[model samples]
Target: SSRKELANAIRALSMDAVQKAKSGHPGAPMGMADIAEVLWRDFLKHNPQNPSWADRDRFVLSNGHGSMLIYSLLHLTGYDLPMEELKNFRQLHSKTPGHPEVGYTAGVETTTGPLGQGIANAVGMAIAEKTLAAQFNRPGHDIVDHYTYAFMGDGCMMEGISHEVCSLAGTLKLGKLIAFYDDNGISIDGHVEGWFTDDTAMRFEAYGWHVIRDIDGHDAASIKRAVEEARAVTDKPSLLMCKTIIGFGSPNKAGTHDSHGAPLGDAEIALTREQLGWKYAPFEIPSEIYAQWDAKEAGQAKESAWNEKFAAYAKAYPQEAAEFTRRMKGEMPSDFDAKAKEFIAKLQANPAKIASRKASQNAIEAFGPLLPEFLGGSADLAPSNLTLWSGSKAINEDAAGNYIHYGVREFGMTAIANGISLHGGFLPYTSTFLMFVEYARNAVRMAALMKQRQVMVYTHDSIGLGEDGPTHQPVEQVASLRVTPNMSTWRPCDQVESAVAWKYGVERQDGPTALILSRQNLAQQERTEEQLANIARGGYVLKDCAGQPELIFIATGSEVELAVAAYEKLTAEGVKARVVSMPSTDAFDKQDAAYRESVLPKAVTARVAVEAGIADYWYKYVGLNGAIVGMTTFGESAPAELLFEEFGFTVDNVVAKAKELLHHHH
Candidate 1:
């Protein structure tokens, strides 16, 4: 069978699935069908049987509104996706979701729906691949080698995050990363000439990328030549600009915006079949096409060869081989829990008065040297975030070190971290001020949506930063993070809890974490052995009276110090009072009802909550009758101490609030 027949298979399947759903974009898959045919058959390296094979070349469909394209590719290429699933596209309980989801689809490498994120994710995957190759690839053995490929459309090029990560990819000189731009020149709002007019080739070239432009997107031979030329460049990432009509197979509406998003109607579909000279029914493929597209045999052969080569490598270097296998499996070291607990014990034994960001650095020192998979970086705030530890080395143009300088790109850094996490070996961590998280909000939410393990270090978490003023202060950020499902927010008070937060964030398998830290030095609250163990439980009694307390003070991060001082004053006055260190609301809420009730019993109506940020989030713990010490408005430009006082985040205000709550309840 000819390759043109195979290309039509994708176009047919994609358009058919979308028309059935009555939703989704059809033009992208049609426009890029010929390029997809050439790459999957000759250039892309993947195993249908073992989709998660560590050495398989990565592929991403960044313009994921064209998700039918990937679903069709997976089904035709003999992945677990069946024709039934393709027919069930955009339907409930189907493997073919509206977009390409990483774990939801067998052959999908990353979750990509929001335009431009897939490019960032592909860059991140390439970063991880390069770093691992630097660490594990030995002389005379090319075990850790594979390319990362992505197909992006005009919409992806128009997104800001695409600009952010593509420049970084070029700056890093990732030779094994290749991107194919589907230069269809059409989107949902129609042809892009009136608004979206950029010399894309020149733009990529300026970003230090190797540019291969103006290829015949519908021609199999030209696409193959471009793929070969892209691989021929070894110093920088490559971009293949493939030009084609938006909806290629249809006689009419093929080059027009009418086919961009909406499905071609029955009349158009019948004409499309005749235009392409295809007689097969919907969701039907000829035996010859199936035979031509099936990759199970070749995929199994590739994996078997890798297994045998791995066995030989193990014989030569047993330690490296075992480590490589373990990391690829996404398992923490056997002694990780024990070592982390021991480190936290040390912090408990020696309490230190320090900034939470500094304490974050100290905690990093405890774990960074042990876990080599802890890939760290900051969005041009490393100095303020203190994200680097003693064992840190910068990832530069010529090097693949553990720490990266992400420049000023927060969204790209976060999306890249998600990609690195999805690639399986690395626990990607990013740093930036909490104020800037608004810019990276969608990426953070996407990480949570995919349930990926990412660590986001958000320092200067509140008005505690002071002189940077309201613009840099984060009042609603913590509350915003608290509301994100599957996202754990950690606002540790001092060195001890900071250590616990780091340990918990690193060990979590299901979701992402936000380390909301402070820049001002906080008074340390001492803890016992039991308290140290209970810290992971999220909410623990920091200091309590012998009997049931008349009032409870719940606080996190910097405000914990104020609560402690208030508890001390109340105890001296012969009143029963308790100070609860509630660092992670998500973790605490997930605790068993028994544990939650024990921490904040229903009987305790007189409660006062404290935090250096917004107040609305505390209302869950502190009922309507209770009080809160938090900022409802932006902070002023002043010293940290003055800001604390002005914001009512002080021991005096907390003590007064506790008294008011107790008296009002009585």
Candidate 2:
């Protein structure tokens, strides 16, 4: 009866909010109310007073259209969410948006409007939890023990990203990860049986998950038993298939799609109120139900107990405890910048022609030992991407490994990395081919939208990664990624620049960074310590003329070498030419206009922009009268050198473009 009362609270708040907003999905919340009541009341370990407790269990609502379910739970559990915020649900600037967002809501763990992303995020969270537990937990102290739970409906299961991440989660043997499948047999388009008929339990079992099937979703006792069983499985993740009615208690719309997204009419609400024996008025909750649902005292006890355990842990292992606290607070090592600069100095002294990917690895190898926060992997491209450091081990059930074989799951990997970032104590990076960024674009966008600090290393950044033909070469990815608000897209030219990008990537806390690296070798540019320090400014002139320059040559990545060559040729011919390496345009734009003008002066308008990718982004750097020696068509299958020569990426091409621009400007 108490469970019924608590469940009705969720239903009432959800329905009332939806009715007031005149938009939203009420069916999923109503159907899942009992599960939410049971889980949050009895199983979910969280502290409302301190939502950022490091050891708290994570809860993700994968079917985010039913965001009211989470809002109700947060409000009922004595979180900072107030009744007025729920009343202002879905209104402009309200905390309760149509879809649950992580930083916007107090108790929300991850943004989840996009189907399957939250499930993938939960997998990432579980990985972080397991990794931290392995690294920190002593024999007697389990300081990093927690579970990651996600609730999803048919839409999440049907999405391809869920399959990718769930499979990897199963393979990783994340025993602390549990997902509840809300099988209501309905979608926004009506019945799901017509299109989504796969046996979910068998599907998960195929992925090596512990499957618990066919439980009454509305029965509190059944839900409790299922969760207990799931918790008992110690070697694999668990999925409980919960059978529920679409709209659980509406008298007329209970079993139909009519109650799925739209608000039930006032007449239907009246009928539902009578049918479910709810005597409370709209938005009015009974005091007894609130008392039963309130978790403030219980949550405080759970956290206080963990704090005591951690205090003992700190007493026994001071260094480990200090490290854990520092990392969990998102603090970097004290010597991070010093070590990064030292590594960059080494790179500057011993310059060589190496692929940017290899340079990236060099940076990783140099700093990976110094910063334990560095955790990264490639999407089945470790050998090519060079993401895994020499001493880094592969992550598994028995050990904590820095490298993960994401197994051709780019989208899943990016989303999972977001979760890892959100779960703190680890700075995550993921690598793949530059062209494959299209597959994971939205996840990358999500990372930026959330203002998360993640590193996305995309190698083979241009047509210079030749012989792969048009499909493999990225013509638009660099420019496209640069356009993402709050994202830093860097096309580092050589080892020193790559190291700087890595330093910037790790040090950047406000937003995500994309390191667009080359597959072909790049000659190191000559730079002074001043230029090296200014590399963090996003763009700087690598070679400047003694007097005011008559022409400017701007380039990125491998093309920078050609710009240098062209600059030398032009100066030899008595034309004052300046060469600029614009590694990260996004970072450059953030600099004050005075600094930007110093790099590319407005008085000297004769400019040539060279890159192996499309020239759309270069137009702003080169004025209307300037020429762009960049790709306008897809690349061909050939050796990289020949591809460059054929595609007009040679020193001669750059010189010719500069001459043309200078003559036109005169």
Candidate 3:
């Protein structure tokens, strides 16, 4: 009976918030109120006063349409969010949105509403806790002991990423994650008979998750027992499926689709209040109810005692604590900038012709050896991506390796790396074949949107991936990555430029880097060390005409050599042509207008751009009077030499494009 009162209070507040907004899903919130009331009051160890406490258990409402339920709980549980914010649900700039966003509200761990991502992020959080415990926890330290809980509805379970991340989570034996299944057996279209009728519990068990069922949502003791049992399990994660009636207390539309989104009318609301035997006014919690929950004051005091232990730990481990604190603030070492500059200098001094991928690999290994906190692994492409650190151990549940071995799950690997990066103690990157970038684009774009400094190393870039044909060749990948906002896309021409690109990525504290590296060997361009260092600034004039240039030859990756050869031909023919190696259009754009113009001068009306594939992306830089020589259609399955020639990516084609651009310029 007491549980019904709490649940009814949740239902009322949720209905009030949704009705006031004139928009939002109220059914899930109303139905799940009892479940949340039972779970939070009993199992969750959250201190509303200190939401950021590391040891506090995490919660993610993947069914974000039920945000009102969470907001109501926070309001009643001493969280800083006021009742006004809940009343203004989904309003502009309100923390209480239709869907939950992480930074927008306290206690909301990660953004949901994209259906499956919250499940994936929760798995990631669990993995982070397990990994951190393995790395930092002593015999009695137990510094990282917390579980990540997620509430997933039918819609979220249907997302494919959920399968990908969960499959891996089970494989990794992530025992600290417990997900709740809100199986109301209903959807937006009335019934779930058409879509999801399979044995969901059996499927999770097959995926190695421990499945628990037959739970009463309104029974607080039952919920608490299930949660405690979940924590007791040592090897596998747990999923507790609680079947409940949607809109449980609504008198007119308790279990119908009509009660899902629209407001419970005033008559229905009044009737529902009478039905639940509640006498409280709107948005009001009885002092008696709060007083009953205030018994946790002693628990809060005990939890706050950890501050003393942490201070003592800091005193005993000053250097480690300092390093830990710096990482928590997302900072690099004092000499990090100097080290990057040195890396750029060293690469430029040894600008030998080699595959850009190899060059990138060298830079990655160098950074890995020096940056102890840098964590990542390739999806079985380390040898090719050159992402394997020579002395770094492979990260596993029992090992102390910083480099991860994510198997062949390229998409999952990237998403998991993003999860580790978001945890705020490690700099995470993932590597794979250039063509496989398609598999990880969603998570990569999410990282960019989050303004994370995560890196994606893609090797075997371009037609050089030959024999592998169109399947392995990254014809349009670079251009697509370049189009993503807050992304730094690099197609380095040589080892030296690749080093510069890597340096640029390390210096960045926000945004993301995609290093597109060549699979074939290339000769280094005749650029000065200073010019190569300028590559960190995005683009620079690699080689230019002695006099003011009449035509400009722009190129990237291995094509830079061809552009330079064509420029030499034009010079020999008494034509003024300048060669510019634009390895990164995004980085160049980030430069000030003066710096950008300095690289691509306005007076150079005639320009010829030559890339290995897809000529369309080069036209904007080439302008109306300029021309480009790149692949027009699908590549032929021939030798890379013949393919490059047939595709018109040769020095001869570059010269022809330059002449055509010059002819059109006049």
Best by lDDT: 2
Better of 1 and 2 by lDDT: 2
Runs in model 1 deviating more than 4 A are 397-400
- Listed per candidate, the RMSD to the true structure in angstroms reads 1.2, 1.4, 2.7
**Candidate 2 Cα deviation (angstroms), residue 99:** 0.9
Report the C-alpha lDDT of model 1 over 1-666, residue by residue, as the tens digit: 789889999999998999998888889899999999999999777899999888999999999988988998899999999999988888888999888887777989888889999999999999989988887778766678899999998889999999999999988999999999999888777779988999999999999999998999999999999999999999999999999888898888998999888889878989999988778999999888999998888889898888887888888889988888888887888999999989888878887899999999998888887788888999988888998898888878335478999999999999999989988778889999999999999999999988888889999988889898999999999999999989999999888889899988888888999999999998888887788888888898989888788989999998888888989999999999888999999999999999998889889888889888888888999989889888899888889888888878777888888888778788
For all candidates in order, the CA lDDT equals 0.89, 0.90, 0.78
Write one digit per residue (lDDT tens) for candidate 2, span 1-666.
578877988888898899889989889999999899888988999999999999999999999999999999999888999989999999999999999988878989999899999999999999999999988999899999999999999999999999999999989999999999999999878889888999899999999999999999989999999999999998999999999997788988987999888999888888888877888887787677778888889999999999999999999999999999998988989988888888899889988899999999888898889778766889999999989787688786245767788999999999999999999999999999999999998999999988889999999988788888889999988989988899999999898899999999999997899999988888988889899888888899999889889988888888888889998999999999898899999999999989998999889878889888898778889868788998888889988888888989888778887887777677
Put the candidates in lDDT order, highest first.
2, 1, 3
Q: Give the TM-score of candidate 2.
A: 0.98
- Rank by TM-score (best first): 1, 2, 3
Backbone clash count for every predicted candidate, in the order shown: 0, 0, 0
Model 2 / residue 119 / CA error / Å: 0.5
**What's the TM-score of each model vs. the native?**
0.98, 0.98, 0.92
**Alpha-carbon shift of residue 186 in model 3 (angstroms):** 2.1
Candidate 3, after superposition: displacement of residue 548 in Å?
3.6
Least well predicted 10-residue stretch by lDDT in candidate 1: 392-401
